């Protein structure tokens with residue numbers, strides 16, 4: 001795998017979103033990975049519906065949090081609508097996949113990166129954007145403005161984001177806090193520290209969609 005990956009440059013990453021007060025980070029991360037894998041496989045960059053996953057992923061808990069693996073398995077089992085057909089409202093509602101016509105895209109499954117393994121996660125990112133989790137509760141992360149973030153932070157992961165690239169010393173993360181946080185909505189998180197958990201627990205739980 002190459003020294004640098006940046007899925008924004010390959011045209012596989014949509015604009016940065018803002019989840020608002022809703023605890024829907026798991027849905028944004030999953031959606032980032034769906035938009036990415038659809039561009040990689042089909043050549044088209046589309047925006048997909050975080051709201052659909054928020055409403056319809058029964059394994060998850062709506063705005064009270066959820067599981068990126070459940071959302072990705074939801075898109076593989078049924079599918080997902082375009083963001084425009086099923087836009088984001090910032091509150092959980094009734095599942096409306098059934099009334100919004102056929103699904104816009106569908107994947108074929110969901111694989112997990114071997115946890116606590118930096119190289120395994122890098123291998124994943126070189127193939128597609130990957131859904132990852134991290135500890136975002138610390139004020140240090142909340143106030144991040146730029147640079148290679150090294151913490152301080154623990155490993156008590158609580159926030160789902162998306163890894164969309166990496167470099168020799170960092171992993172590039174698309175957050176869902178709007179374009180005004182961090183590096184235009186992104187954070188570069190230090191890697192290579194030898195902490196098996198990753199900075200802010202970044203290696204705790206990583207999933208990516210599969211598309212034949």
Ligand SMILES: *C(C(=O)O)[C@H](O)C(=O)N[C@@H](CC(C)C)C(=O)NCCCCNC(N)=[NH2+]
Pocket residue numbers: 019022023024025026061064065066067068133134157158159160
């Ligand atoms: C994301 C956010 O807005 O920060 C949101 O809180 C979330 O999905 N949190 C996850 C943790 C990450 C995915 C690691 C979470 O808490 N998942 C477990 C389910 C939600 C909490 N439990 C219940 N019953 N609601």
